[PDB]
Amino acid sequence: ASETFEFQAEITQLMSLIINTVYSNKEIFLREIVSNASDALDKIRYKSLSDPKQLETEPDLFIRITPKPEQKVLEIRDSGIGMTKAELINNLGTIAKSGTKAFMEALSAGADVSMIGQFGVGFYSLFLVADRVQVISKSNDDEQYIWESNAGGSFTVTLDEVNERIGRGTILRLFLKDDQLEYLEEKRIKEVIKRHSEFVAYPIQLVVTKEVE
Amino acid sequence: ASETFEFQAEITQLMSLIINTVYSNKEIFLREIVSNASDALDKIRYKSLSDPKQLETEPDLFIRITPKPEQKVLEIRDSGIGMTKAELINNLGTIAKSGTKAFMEALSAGADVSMIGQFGVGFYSLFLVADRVQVISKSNDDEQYIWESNAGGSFTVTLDEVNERIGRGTILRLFLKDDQLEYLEEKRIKEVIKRHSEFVAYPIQLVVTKEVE
Ligand SMILES: COC1=C2C[C@@H](C)C[C@H](OC)[C@H](O)[C@@H](C)/C=C(\C)[C@H](OC(N)=O)[C@@H](OC)/C=C\C=C(/C)C(=O)NC(=CC1=O)C2=O
Ligand SMILES: COC1=C2C[C@@H](C)C[C@H](OC)[C@H](O)[C@@H](C)/C=C(\C)[C@H](OC(N)=O)[C@@H](OC)/C=C\C=C(/C)C(=O)NC(=CC1=O)C2=O
């Protein structure tokens, strides 16, 4: 059974700003995702310096992108530290974030949306291309859980009994907007990664499905 | 919680024959898989001729092959009719199969293992390349279940709360033997499909993971 939580009030305004004031350079949503994935991977690796067993739930360190064009879904998986239920609730919307108001004021004064990660709120850039998001996460210290939002004022957290097991880490599952289906394409993905994600210490894999001809 | 079932006694001998008398032309295991997938897809499509709603749990008709080299696993998914719990128990080992004994006698007299599907027992050819198998299946008339065997005299059936949801159909998950890892390779898979699976009415997709370079 899901629990429902209410977003802290400036997070709700930030999301509705991102959905509705919008327009240009939406592709930076993937740079923010990859940069969060890389932060999560840095954390497990640093953690494991003095607790090597932490690594054993998923020994390989990677970022993987899987288009699912039939569901209009883009998934980005990392094998980073992952998040517990309580981390999903606290850190993904119930507690105020330090740069939320400041980024909104920056935006209104003319700042590029691209600055969003410098405000510590770049996760919310995913609503540029998606009207719905699931974050499926598995921390070594908890069970697998699904966080879900349609950017509507509330989110749900649900013990995961429906998705593949990740050994450890997170899957970001974007239900893309009908106008943003270009991010389902191999060539577009590669261009965006090569443009804004050149210096990443982890391998970035792309999963492509082709017909045997 | 899993239930355990015992294999009918000639199925156990067939499996241990396949594991141990062996040697040559192991690649026909994929022709048998694809041919079963195609039979399952024919059945849903025929069924839907007079009950079109059956199709709506998974509108696309396909066979998909996904190597997972890090787990030494080959998955083959179809969106065919799927099987209920009771069909997995009955049809995947507890009840005697008509050609089991006859195929064993044919084999001993010198028959090519390749004849196995002409005896109606070709599912068991997967133990040529795998020491363990899961069949994860979702029929419109039941929940998702996992059947599992290590070819040891018994199998388990378990309500699925750990794998991705299939809308409808089956995933064959092969834990390949260390000597049979060639079936993890894109080029080998394609050769085997092109050789023995030329006339298939459904698209066969291959899922390939590559590093963004
Ligand atoms: C310092 O780390 C970062 C923080 C502080 C805090 C949340 C860290 C978090 O604590 C529980 C974990 O330490 C860390 C492993 C999890 C992230 C990197 C997640 O990424 C994935 N792939 O796990 C990302 O997932 C949706 C979650 C929230 C982001 C908020 C809404 C924001 O937008 N920006 C941030 C980007 C960051 O790099 C941020 O606030
Ligand atoms: C006539 O159909 C076939 C039968 C008769 C009977 C089992 C049919 C089954 O009834 C419940 C469903 O109608 C059908 C949709 C399911 C299969 C095609 C499955 O394939 C997948 N992809 O679903 C395959 O899965 C592991 C299962 C068992 C095979 C036994 C051990 C054997 O080896 N060979 C057979 C190959 C066949 O084509 C066989 O006995």
PDB file of C-alpha atoms in Angstrom, chain A residues 60 64 68 70 160-165 186 190 193 203-212, chain B residues 60 64 68 70 160-165 186 190 193 203-212:
ATOM      1  CA  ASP A  60      30.004  -2.916 -11.051  1.00  0.00           C
ATOM      2  CA  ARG A  64      22.888   2.992 -17.895  1.00  0.00           C
ATOM      3  CA  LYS A  68      11.448   2.083 -23.796  1.00  0.00           C
ATOM      4  CA  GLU A  70       6.591   1.591 -26.553  1.00  0.00           C
ATOM      5  CA  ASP A 160       8.596  -2.196  -4.521  1.00  0.00           C
ATOM      6  CA  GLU A 161       7.060  -5.505  -5.436  1.00  0.00           C
ATOM      7  CA  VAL A 162       6.624  -4.765  -9.157  1.00  0.00           C
ATOM      8  CA  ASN A 163      10.032  -3.839 -10.709  1.00  0.00           C
ATOM      9  CA  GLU A 164      13.212  -5.818 -11.368  1.00  0.00           C
ATOM     10  CA  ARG A 165      15.549  -6.078  -8.402  1.00  0.00           C
ATOM     11  CA  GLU A 186      19.978   6.700 -29.722  1.00  0.00           C
ATOM     12  CA  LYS A 190      24.581  10.388 -27.572  1.00  0.00           C
ATOM     13  CA  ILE A 193      25.840  13.082 -23.403  1.00  0.00           C
ATOM     14  CA  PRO A 203      31.035   4.273 -17.878  1.00  0.00           C
ATOM     15  CA  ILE A 204      27.765   5.458 -19.421  1.00  0.00           C
ATOM     16  CA  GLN A 205      25.947   2.595 -21.218  1.00  0.00           C
ATOM     17  CA  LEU A 206      23.165   2.918 -23.673  1.00  0.00           C
ATOM     18  CA  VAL A 207      20.731   0.088 -24.209  1.00  0.00           C
ATOM     19  CA  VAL A 208      19.511  -0.231 -27.726  1.00  0.00           C
ATOM     20  CA  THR A 209      16.983  -2.680 -29.090  1.00  0.00           C
ATOM     21  CA  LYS A 210      17.244  -3.715 -32.747  1.00  0.00           C
ATOM     22  CA  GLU A 211      15.372  -6.122 -35.026  1.00  0.00           C
ATOM     23  CA  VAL A 212      17.345  -9.152 -36.215  1.00  0.00           C
TER      24      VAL A 212
ATOM     25  CA  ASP B  60       2.762  -5.591 -29.333  1.00  0.00           C
ATOM     26  CA  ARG B  64      13.136 -10.231 -27.529  1.00  0.00           C
ATOM     27  CA  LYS B  68      23.071  -9.907 -19.301  1.00  0.00           C
ATOM     28  CA  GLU B  70      27.487  -9.588 -15.860  1.00  0.00           C
ATOM     29  CA  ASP B 160       6.551 -13.175  -8.607  1.00  0.00           C
ATOM     30  CA  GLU B 161       7.292 -10.175  -6.462  1.00  0.00           C
ATOM     31  CA  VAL B 162      10.892  -9.683  -7.636  1.00  0.00           C
ATOM     32  CA  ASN B 163      10.965  -9.252 -11.469  1.00  0.00           C
ATOM     33  CA  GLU B 164       9.719  -6.520 -13.802  1.00  0.00           C
ATOM     34  CA  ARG B 165       6.055  -6.777 -14.715  1.00  0.00           C
ATOM     35  CA  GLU B 186      25.541 -10.240 -30.391  1.00  0.00           C
ATOM     36  CA  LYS B 190      22.469 -13.332 -34.910  1.00  0.00           C
ATOM     37  CA  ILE B 193      18.873 -16.935 -35.465  1.00  0.00           C
ATOM     38  CA  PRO B 203       9.852  -9.617 -35.069  1.00  0.00           C
ATOM     39  CA  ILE B 204      12.884 -10.895 -33.158  1.00  0.00           C
ATOM     40  CA  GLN B 205      14.616  -8.065 -31.227  1.00  0.00           C
ATOM     41  CA  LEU B 206      18.042  -8.138 -29.768  1.00  0.00           C
ATOM     42  CA  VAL B 207      18.948  -5.902 -26.870  1.00  0.00           C
ATOM     43  CA  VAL B 208      22.479  -4.684 -26.929  1.00  0.00           C
ATOM     44  CA  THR B 209      24.233  -2.536 -24.367  1.00  0.00           C
ATOM     45  CA  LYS B 210      27.084  -0.289 -25.524  1.00  0.00           C
ATOM     46  CA  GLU B 211      29.360   2.275 -23.870  1.00  0.00           C
ATOM     47  CA  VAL B 212      28.872   5.884 -24.978  1.00  0.00           C
TER      48      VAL B 212
END
